[PDB]
From TrEMBL, chain A:
Domain of life of the organism encoding this protein: Viruses
UniProt gene name: ORF40
Portion held of the full protein: 1109 to 1156 of 1396
Transmembrane segments: none
Protein name (database record): Major capsid protein
Length: 48, 48
């Protein structure tokens, strides 16, 4: 099992910002906006 | 899995050995020897 590893490096050369993100489009929403409560009883906290 | 707040909406044909799913599911041979096509053969049936 030849473990090929290639160490390298990289450095930025920008005074302000030379790279921008632009959230533009929308795919399908991942979590449904349905009806879901929470039952905080999971937490063994407080004096009973 | 659709309206999770509840468990069903038809307590009389969504349960095992209920009023409807014994009548409309051919595994029990109620309307077996009857050659009429009833269009509920697919909405109530455990398929292969």
């Amino acid at each position: 099992n030849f473990t090929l590893t290639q160490p390298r490096a990289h450095v930025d050369l920008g005074v302000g910002y030379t790279a921008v993100c632009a959230t533009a489009a929308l795919r399908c929403p991942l979590t449904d906006m349905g009806n879901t409560a929470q039952n905080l009883f999971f937490s063994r906290g407080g004096v009973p | 899995v659709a309206y999770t707040d509840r468990a069903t909406l038809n307590p009389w044909a969504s349960q095992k050995h209920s009023y409807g799913d014994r009548l409309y599911n051919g595994t029990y041979n109620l309307t077996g020897a009857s050659p009429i096509y009833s269009p509920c053969f697919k909405f109530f049936t455990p398929a292969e």
